[PDB]
Design a protein around this ligand. Structure first.
Ligand SMILES: CC(C)(Sc1ccc(CCN(CCCCC2CCCCC2)C(=O)NC2CCCCC2)cc1)C(=O)O
Lengths: 13, 263
């Protein structure tokens, strides 16, 4: 769930 | 598919993305790092290794809360290293981003506690980018609940270390931890299960090659994965108790995001 994990999303981006 | 080559790519990604590897840690743990074995040496180590933390400011917080803050910083750094490693695992970057997030959320602490074994011996652990060593007895001496955090990790580590794995093995074990198709809430379960089967097969063949003396090493490692899931579920419960009952122990936002709705 990208919406609930913006900080992990940013690391992945 | 070239499984020796997949193993090598994963090993190279692990050497590239983690600042600490097992050969390095053993070079240091032989012989020098600054030894934290009591409150005097904790305070000296803070002034040499984390100077900003105690340049006034939380310098007046309890030693346990200062240590806990430093541990949160280290976990934040390790999650970043694990994310870079995951992106280099063949196939991970082709997954849906929602699934990449889910696999990281559930896998990172299992991988952290596996990798923590490489810097532990029965007397303590190498910390601060190889520049400090904090004794197991010092950690047990902290007030509750903070003395309860590390001891189960040392217990896991002593038996994990007895398997005598090297970095070529551990890299594949960490990849297998991450590429797990039974995490809650995956979208493309079948794709992830096939990726898991592939990584696990790479691990099985590698252990046959690298550890011909130990015919049970693969099922031993499957059991260690299950032990790590349990260790993380318990750790998450303890972190919840700390965050809820200790006001100077608020969680860093990246860690809160990982633990939120985890177990
Ligand atoms: C932070 C929680 C909320 S609880 C938790 C989780 C993990 C740990 C182990 C942290 N640590 C000691 C870091 C000790 C720093 C030292 C303190 C004394 C003054 C000098 C600096 C360390 O070396 N970790 C390795 C990193 C290399 C790769 C493997 C892991 C401790 C507590 C979390 O769940 O994240």
């Amino acid at each position: 769930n990208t919406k609930n994990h913006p900080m992990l999303m940013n690391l992945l981006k | 598919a070239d499984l020796k080559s997949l193993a090598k790519r994963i090993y190279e990604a692990y050497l590239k993305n983690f600042n600490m590897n097992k050969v390095k840690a053993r070079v240091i743990l032989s012989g020098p790092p600054f030894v934290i074995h009591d409150m005097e040496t904790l305070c000296m180590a803070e002034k040499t290794l984390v100077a900003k933390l105690v340049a006034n400011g939380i310098q007046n917080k309890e030693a346990e809360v200062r240590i806990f803050h430093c541990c949160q910083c280290t976990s934040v750094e390790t999650v970043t290293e694990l994310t870079e490693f995951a992106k280099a695992i063949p196939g991970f970057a082709n997954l849906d981003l929602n699934d990449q997030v889910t696999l990281l959320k559930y896998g990172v602490y299992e991988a952290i506690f596996a990798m923590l074994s490489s810097v532990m011996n029965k007397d303590g652990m190498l910390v601060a980018y190889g520049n400090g060593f904090i004794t197991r007895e010092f950690l047990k001496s902290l007030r509750k609940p903070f003395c309860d955090i590390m001891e189960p990790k040392f217990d896991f580590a002593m038996k994990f270390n007895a398997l005598e794995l090297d970095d070529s093995d551990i890299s594949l074990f960490v990849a297998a931890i991450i590429c797990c198709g039974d995490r809650p809430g995956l979208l493309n379960v079948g794709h992830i299960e096939k990726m898991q089967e592939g990584i696990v097969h790479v691990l099985r063949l590698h252990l046959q090659s690298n550890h011909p003396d130990d015919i049970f090493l693969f099922p031993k490692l499957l059991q260690k994965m299950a032990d790590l899931r349990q260790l993380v579920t318990e750790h998450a419960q303890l972190v919840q108790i700390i965050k809820k009952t200790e006001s100077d122990a608020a969680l860093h936002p990246l860690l809160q995001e990982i633990y939120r709705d985890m177990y």
